[model samples]
Target chain A: GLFGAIAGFIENGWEGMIDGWYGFRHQNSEGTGQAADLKSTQAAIDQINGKLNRVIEKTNEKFHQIEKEFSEVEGRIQDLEKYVEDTKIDLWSYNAELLVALENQHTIDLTDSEMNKLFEKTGRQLRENAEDMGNGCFKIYHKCDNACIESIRNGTYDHDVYRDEALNNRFQ
Target chain B: PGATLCLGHHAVPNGTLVKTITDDQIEVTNATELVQSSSTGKICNNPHRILDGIDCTLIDALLGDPHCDVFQNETWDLFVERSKAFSNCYPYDVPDYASLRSLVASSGTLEFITEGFTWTGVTQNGGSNACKRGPGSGFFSRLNWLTKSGSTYPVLNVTMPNNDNFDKLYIWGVHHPSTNQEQTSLYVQASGRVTVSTRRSQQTIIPNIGSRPWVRMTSARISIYWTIVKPGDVLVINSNGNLIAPRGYFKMRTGKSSIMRSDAPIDTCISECITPNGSIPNDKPFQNVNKITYGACPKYVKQNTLKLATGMRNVPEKQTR
Candidate 1:
């Protein structure tokens, strides 16, 4: 009875292999084993494509985030440049005015009110320029976070250990 | 045998020749004798003085005994000639020299030959005070205030000191005993009447005598070495050594003026002076003009209409100043 059971198991395994090969060819008469193999390979490729589509969608989302960050930094820098330029013009105008006043008389007649106005105006311009420079510096300092996000989306910063550490930090 | 009958104790040998012995003295050769004479001459010869008319006391004097008087006179002449030559070589390097000539031509104006002595009573108080011929009565000689209380600001209208010359303008004043501080306040006014508002005051720390503290002002001088005086640049020495005007002060070594006026924007004078207007807070995007006065932005608005677009986060073509 035990020997009969063993023989029956072997017969089932052989029949299943034969059916798998023959059934594939039966669907296409002109197809050899190559056609069957090709079909199997195509199925695998379709599955991989689905996974790749998902990855691309995720990468695009990350890229948009980076672009937004870069735009904000750029805007801040441009504002700083304009502020400096404005200060330059004001200072130059005042210097020219002073020169003209000096030339018109033996001794330049400057009133206290006039001197105070010039001083306050010049000081304000300088202070404005200094503030812009400081803001530009802050934007550059935070760039590392944006860079890391971009690198991870590109698989450049991705690693098994890195992923584990990142998840741990997130949870913490 | 016939001669031996006279001396039996000593007999001379037959046919012997007689020779006389003399002391062995070295004879002098011409070359060796000359060498000995030369060595002795070197040790015994008297040395003659090389310098003429040098007076030990007057080391810095133009001419003195025991010093090179002729060379000293020639040196002065050379200095004057070189000055003339330099003026000819680079005409721009020297002014008309009329100012110096006028100063020398004035009566009681003694020409200083050396840098050792200080001039007394050469007033710098923007007055016609003449330099006295004799030693000044006080320890400090008063320079007429270029801008005294009675006179106008920027008391002297002279051009800045020459770059190549070394000149010192000394100011001396006593401390107001009432203020307890040595009358040490120096005021500098750049342009116009130095109104009480524009007058910058610097305090000086001078030692005072007990109670009265007669703080004699001495040596309040600025030495301008190799400095170029530019037009409209004035050097006003207040009671303190602080210099005012021309927007910048002169550097001692090179004597070049580095003027940076606080009133003028850096970009107007220097290209790298441009900096950002960080005066506005980050939270307020439209507050770019907060730090600057409305008058400063008149022309700037027209030139930077596009820049305003970026600042306001507006589309460039649709943006208005």
Candidate 2:
């Protein structure tokens, strides 16, 4: 009887070992599949993070470029304003002299050549000043870092339909 | 092979003979051919509910029936009746001339002809009826006397006709010497006592010689002189019997014979002379009489008159004489 019981005990132990081994192997296979999936998900996340970082960097670069161009334009406008003010002062002085001469009705003793030279100088200076002023205004108001600024300056953005489209495009 | 219970049914020696039966039976059966069919049935039905609500008949009635013809028919009939009635109305008519003449004559100022002395003719140059004097011969003489010489200065004096009673005067005439293309002197003077009952006043007419050459060139160029004249006071004239510039003063030349001269003496060479009976001289120019027409009541004259009384007393109190 003892021997029989020993044999039955050995058989039960073998069955339990096989069952435990199968269960362990099955769990290990499932764990391996899960690990592969987790690795793939991590790779995708890393790729997305890299792409986001690249976008941020590109946008920052664009912003800096726009800021630099804006600064340059502002500097040019300031220079143009200074030029206009100086030229306007010169014209005012000339006009004052002309008014005095007209009021007195006396010959100003200038030769014909001198008079012609002075008039040509004043005319040229005025034309140049006007052109500078107009161009400066255009550059300051219209030539921003975006195409929208150009469109606005051209009056194409004034339409209600275009405005709505622009606004929708911005949100999208 | 029939009831194979060989392990436990029979009594066997304990632990002696354990017979292990190993059977490897192979039954080679062809694969079974089975057909399985699935059937599904679908039923479509809509579950609709009928809800209880208020009737729309009352709402439609309160809002007026959309298809009703009552409002349109009544509006058409009312418009037709109104148009017919409007067509029957008549336009207003003006009255005839005979009826209008009677209405005008009834409420007008009384017209009368004075029988004592008729106006033979006016010999003066400045007053009304200047051209109607003395058959056109004496008219030219009087005009020559008033304005013969361009430099002829006629003196004007404002005074009461009688020394016993002081009355205001109304004078009208032309002034000579054109300046700045405008007749410099056309004036109206208000002079006399300021009594509530007999508010005495005077009006002097000075025609602009520059504007009307016929009057100034033909008549004597009279300088309208006064002993004392004040600011804010003026003199005007009636040229050809029309009253003009009731408040304008004479802009006098600074030298002698000008209206601005205070030392000039008054003369009757222009105004008619007076008689002992206090009537104007009949042989004198204006019907031989200087008829000073007294204005109605003090209030009636004062209503249209300006008070130009300078504080200076009337110089030469003989103006009343």
Candidate 3:
């Protein structure tokens, strides 16, 4: 019951209670055994103070780390937002452009003989000249001399980009 | 003795008047270019340039035409302007430039449709799902260009359907190549990505619409004229070549049409049971996250006939496992 009372007093007025203990020990200095008991009690209280201070310091450090991490996460989110906005595709415009290109190129009808001849001619040219990309994919070498295609030949152009360009050239 | 009157696909040798089919009218100035069938008195517009077999100028440049100068700088806007001039001589009824522009301007209303089989079946996990062919446990949908009489046509007119259950679509075409034992295939992904594949070669003709392939089709209509250039080569030209306005219909005039419907008595695996983890050999329910990264599902190819289903047409959402 005395220890519980001391613990309650420490929680309510830790500094004041410590001062009272010091005064009480000093006032009854004639009782040497009581003074020794007071000394051990003061040592126990000092040990608790050390542990409490360490715990408080650790809690503050963890809070700081969480705050720093939150700011970093926010920065990443902002960067992602900007990137998505920049790279968004114009769906209507693209589909429309493809549609118009389709109308222009694919109007003529040919006889079977002419169709067969053209097929043979184009196939043979592609078979001979086109670079193989493996997996049934052929990178066409355009016969037409152009800046873009020339760049492709010079190894400056991306193959995927050129492939799409040629594809649009042939289809839409 | 003068210019003849044309009706349907046949021609009447007369000097004047023709009956009007409806209130809408179309005028053709050059009557000499028109031909008539002897059996039926229907007027057919037969232009003589068919012998010339005109090809794209870009193609000529692609085929090593050193003389390619003007077509080198071809663009979509430039192509549209050029098509306007050539539209007059074209025999098929081309859609008006005004309406076409409006269609593109309001492209969100336009619908994307699949022109081949849409098979839905239970996976190995005994759950119903829809699967597509190529690198997965799915059936390869096919468009048989050959008619029942073993005849092939170069041109196919497909009208994208208005009502489809699915948001995205896949178009797959099968071509019987003359060279070797090669199976030529064309796939048009829902995102407008076009690819042609043969025995040893695969080429992407058009890039995907960014990451959005299933863009909401809000456009009023989409008419596709798919012309097979060769076994693997194809040109998907969008035009209003139809004289008759029969919406959501497939008009094939070259041969007799026989399209297989979904009610056909064919049973096969359409989609494999996909799990969150790679193909699991142990008996477990499939928690669908994506396809396999390790083991593959069993491959099944069932003999399918030339069945025709409307693009994204409604089917039973769930079927018996």
Candidate 4:
């Protein structure tokens, strides 16, 4: 403790003196023959380190992208759920029409193909309802009243910016 | 081999002779280009003083090059200017430069239209009702409304008129997309994917007009094209529970040609239903501010709306997005 200042000064002095004596080159015992190109060696390692940094950053970036996509997909899962409920309601409506026939023993009679024809109305109705579900809501009720409107608007408007895509993954 | 009998007005170079194909006229002088009788009133041929700087540069760049592609196209345009003098060479035409573009709409010979459908089961709750995919007179009322939906809910169902020369169909239409409290939305689907929606923000046929999909000025309506409809092909038009604002109409074409119209018993195509609605489900309908978003309709719907009204084409008032 008492020699702290003395020690720091001595440490600095010897460190400088020794560093002059022994640099990274730590040359050969004979201390001859060009001393192995420290500059050249450092240049090679620096180049390699640069590439390694890029690789690490790029890998990290790709993982983050996947995570973002996963988040989108997770949110869409709820949309799919709403779609299911809509279709289910439409199916029930179609079934209710059958009940009309039940009361009067074929109140309405159309061929199988004809049934498909009427499905338009049912499907359209289903989608409208499902969309209402998918569309945004009143944050006042479905909110804690903080800034839920901001978040909902962000989500709702984003989905809508993708105007339309009429696809049937009938495969889905 | 030459006579001096030029038709119309010709100011050929002093040393030249311009004889019609029939050797109508003759003269003598230094001449390199044809007279371009079609460009008679318009001074089109003064190579020393070319018009259209863009064209001049394009052609000048190509002048030295013997095999420039621009020559084939441009020369034809120049050729047409010259050839149009011959009624035989050209049936009838003019250069695009010769024609000034106006806000005129393309009135594609809209013809052979039937009235809108109506529900046969007349009496219902509010006023009168029409159900989707159900038997109806005209889906749309020629007068006030055959299928009125404001206080009530009426579905517009269209049935194939049990006859047609063709079996398949290509469908197209226009409609207002509305979704507000009292205002209803629209719903329509084809039996197949014979559907294509090609609506860019603004469909620019050389003019955006800062404009709308549908126009009342000269009749422009954003329309959907292609969907199948046949005898068995049925269509339904309905709204959500309340049934307020609705708009649209659909048309089916089997590439319906004269051949199909006059073919065998299998070729007897008759009146098929084209249900009209104001709005389809997915579209962002008019804001609550606008009462009736009439301009939201498409060409298909406008054509039908005109047909529904009368021989007179109604003005599609106030074009909007």
Candidate that scores best on lDDT: 3
lDDT of 3 by residue, A133-167 (tens): 32222345433234433342233544454354455
Model 2 misplaced stretches (Cα beyond 4 Å):
A1-172, B1-145, B148-154, B161-171, B175-209, B212-321
Candidate 3 deviant stretches above 4 angstroms: A1-172, B1-151, B164-166, B173-321
**How close to the true structure is residue B246 of candidate 3, measured as C-alpha lDDT?**
15
TM-score of each model, in listed order: 0.16, 0.13, 0.15, 0.19
Worst 10 residues of 2 chain B by lDDT: B1-10
| lDDT by residue for model 3 (B1-321), tens | 001100001111222211112211212111110111111111111210011102232222211122322333222211111111221110111123233332222221122222442211101111001221233322111121221112211222333332432222122322212122111111111222234333343433322121212212211112222221233332222211111111121111121111100111112222222121212221111112222111222211111111111011111212357
Question: What's the i-RMS for candidate 1 in angstroms?
Answer: 59.9
True contacts kept of each: 0.01, 0.00, 0.00, 0.00
Q: Which ten residues in a row have the lowest lDDT in candidate 4 chain A?
A: A60-69
* Residue B76 displacement (Å), model 4: 26
Residue range B1-321, candidate 2, lDDT tens digits: 000000000011111111111211111101110111111111101110111111211111111122211221111000000111110001111123222222212212111111121111212333222223333322211111222123222232222222222111221223343343222232222111111111233434433333334341333233211211233332222122112111111121111110000111222232121111121211201121111111110110111111111110111111234
TM-score between candidate 3 and the true structure: 0.15
Model 1 lDDT tens row, A1-172: 1222111211111122211111111111222121122232233234434433432231100000001011223456557666676666577445433422222121111111222232233224222111112211101111123333333223354334344433443343
Residue-wise lDDT of candidate 4 within A22-105, one digit each (tens)? 111111223311112233234323543443333223110000000101112445655765566556445644433332223112
Q: Is candidate 2 or candidate 3 better by lDDT?
A: 3
